Amino acid sequence: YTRVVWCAVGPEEQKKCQQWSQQSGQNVTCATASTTDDCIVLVLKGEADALNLDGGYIYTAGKCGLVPVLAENRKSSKHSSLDCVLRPTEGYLAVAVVKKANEGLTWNSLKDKKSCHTAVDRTAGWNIPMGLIVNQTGSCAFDEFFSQSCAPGADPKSRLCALCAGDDQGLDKCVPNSKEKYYGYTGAFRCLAEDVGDVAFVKNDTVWENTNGESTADWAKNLKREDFRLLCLDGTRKPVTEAQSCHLAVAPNHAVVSRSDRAAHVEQVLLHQQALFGKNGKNCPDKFCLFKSETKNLLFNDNTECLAKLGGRPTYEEYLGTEYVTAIANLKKCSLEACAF
Ligand SMILES: *[C@@H]1O[C@H](CO)[C@@H](O[C@@H]2O[C@H](CO)[C@@H](O[C@@H]3O[C@H](CO)[C@@H](O)[C@H](O)[C@@H]3O)[C@H](O)[C@H]2NC(C)=O)[C@H](O)[C@H]1NC(C)=O
Numbered sequence: 014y015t016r017v018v019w020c021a022v023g024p025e026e027q028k029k030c031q032q033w034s035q036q037s038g039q040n041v042t043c044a045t046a047s048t049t050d051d052c053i054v055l056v057l058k059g060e061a062d063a064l065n066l067d068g069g070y071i072y073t074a075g076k077c078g079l080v081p082v083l084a085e086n087r088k089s090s091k092h093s094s095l096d097c098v099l100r101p102t103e104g105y106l107a108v109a110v111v112k113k114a115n116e117g118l119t120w121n122s123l124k125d126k127k128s129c130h131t132a133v134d135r136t137a138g139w140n141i142p143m144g145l146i147v148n149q150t151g152s153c154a155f156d157e158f159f160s161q162s163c164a165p166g167a168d169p170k171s172r173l174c175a176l177c178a179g180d181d182q183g184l185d186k187c188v189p190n191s192k193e194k195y196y197g198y199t200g201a202f203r204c205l206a207e208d209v210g211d212v213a214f215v216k217n218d219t220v221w222e223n224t225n226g227e228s229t230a231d232w233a234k235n236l237k238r239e240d241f242r243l244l245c246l247d248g249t250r251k252p253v254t255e256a257q258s259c260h261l262a263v264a265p266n267h268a269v270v271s272r273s274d275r276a277a278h279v280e281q282v283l284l285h286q287q288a289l290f291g292k293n294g295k296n297c298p299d300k301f302c303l304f305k306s307e308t309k310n311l312l313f314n315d316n317t318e319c320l321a322k323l324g325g326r327p328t329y330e331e332y333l334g335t336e337y338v339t340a341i342a343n344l345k346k347c348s349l350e351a352c353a354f
């Protein structure tokens with residue numbers, strides 16, 4: 014039992030983290046970086062212990078020796094009697110969404126359109142969609158497929174950032190952190206919702222969580238589920254109720270990572286931390302809820318029921334799965350063995 018230093022990405026995550034530190038009796042304390050990549054580095058240097066990551070980053074960090082410790086787990090149906098922490102992870106659905114009013118727009122007519130990506134290097138926002146697109150066009154010029162986009166992490170003065178709005182002052186345009194208006198699952202969807210982009214690459218849950226009154230956010234309060242459509246790969250368009258049969262791929266859940274030599278300790282702390290601030294924790298909603306940040310998915314996705322033990326003591330390659338790891342590899346060829354830092 015020593016303190017665990019969590020790594021927060023951006024001003025908003027550091028704010029939520031300090032609260033968490035406050036309530037934990039400093040059993041958990043924070044470190045901050047303007048980028049996920051930066052936070053990965055802090056964890057290598059040993060200046061930070063852990064952070065929750067998207068599959069795409071789990072792959073970057075894995076190459077540098079970091080290891081998955083616990084994964085996020087949401088509501089399910091299968092394995093009913095099984096507890097949340099012991100229940101296997103179901104993965105999530107990567108989808109392409111568009112406005113229903115935008116008739117005629119299909120998977121086959123995306124070229125030269127305007128896109129909304131969660132952030133460069135992420136599973137549903139970048140890797141899956143651009144990987145399919147490169148494949149399909151047999152070209153690495155994915156920087157010229159769309160006319161304009163908002164893909165946080167790309168060159169600020171390039172097309173891939175043309176649609177990004179930066180923060181409330183216009184500062185930090187395209188930064189890969191919640192300070193970018195159109196960053197992440199929620200940002201990318203708002204990007205489509207305000208008709209800045211023609212399509213948004215997010216996960217199916219994002220569409221449900223921000224429509225039909227589920228989100229009290231000004232931009233989403235009058236958003237209606239029937240006004241959106243999913244682009245399937247067979248060229249069709251289906252209601253967002255057919256996600257199970259109209260997705261680009263199923264992605265591995267976001268997971269908490271740490272250096273291998275710190276994984277056991279980080280694991281210990283977090284199980285006890287969610288026992289206090291988890292879904293039905295002792296001090297939630299009473300004092301602090303670890304999985305609530307208000308439709309902003311800070312540190313953890315707001316739809317996380319609990320952090321689950323992995324089991325099978327998976328290497329980062331086995332956690333992400335073999336089909337996904339190859340997808341990432343082939344895409345990386347465009348822009349084999351070596352830590353990127
Ligand atoms: C797409 O995402 C949406 C939401 O992220 C998912 O839909 C949801 O379906 C689940 C389970 O089928 C519902 O969760 C339920 O909780 C209730 C508690 O009252 C419980 O009775 C059930 O056992 C269930 O776990 C949930 O209400 C519903 N979400 C919303 C916001 O309507 C869906 O799983 C995803 N679909 C695909 C194909 O990925």
Ligand SMILES: *[C@@H]1O[C@H](CO)[C@@H](O[C@@H]2O[C@H](CO)[C@@H](O[C@H]3O[C@H](CO)[C@@H](O)[C@H](O)[C@@H]3O)[C@H](O)[C@H]2NC(C)=O)[C@H](O)[C@H]1NC(C)=O
Pocket residue numbers: 141144145148335336337339340343
């Ligand atoms: C884009 O097209 C890519 C090439 O066709 C494709 O990459 C391939 O990924 C699959 C599955 O991960 C691999 O195919 C393999 O077939 C069976 C089933 O997975 C394996 O047991 C075999 O060993 C074999 O590897 C390919 O290895 C891989 N292609 C290359 C060049 O290595 C991507 O999956 C496609 N991208 C998307 C998003 O679908």
Ligand SMILES: *[C@@H]1O[C@H](CO)[C@@H](O[C@@H]2O[C@H](CO)[C@@H](O)[C@H](O)[C@H]2NC(C)=O)[C@H](O)[C@H]1NC(C)=O
Pocket residue numbers: 014036037038040285289
């Ligand atoms: C801070 O961490 C410590 C270690 O988990 C917690 O103190 C423990 O309290 C439990 C409850 O009975 C005991 O089982 C342990 O023996 C205690 N640890 C020791 C030996 O110091 C404490 O609960 C944590 N505080 C918060 C708010 O998270």
Ligand SMILES: CS(=O)(=O)Nc1ccc([N+](=O)[O-])cc1Oc1ccccc1
Pocket residue numbers: 330331332333334335336
């Ligand atoms: C068993 S593992 O280490 O968790 N990797 C893995 C996980 C999931 C899937 N899949 O297709 O859903 C596929 C996976 O790997 C392979 C895919 C195609 C052929 C052989 C292995």
Ligand SMILES: [Fe+3]
Pocket residue numbers: 067068135136137267
């Ligand atoms: Fe993701």
Ligand SMILES: [Zn+2]
Pocket residue numbers: 260262263
């Ligand atoms: Zn599928």
Ligand SMILES: [Zn+2]
Pocket residue numbers: 325326327328331
């Ligand atoms: Zn194994």
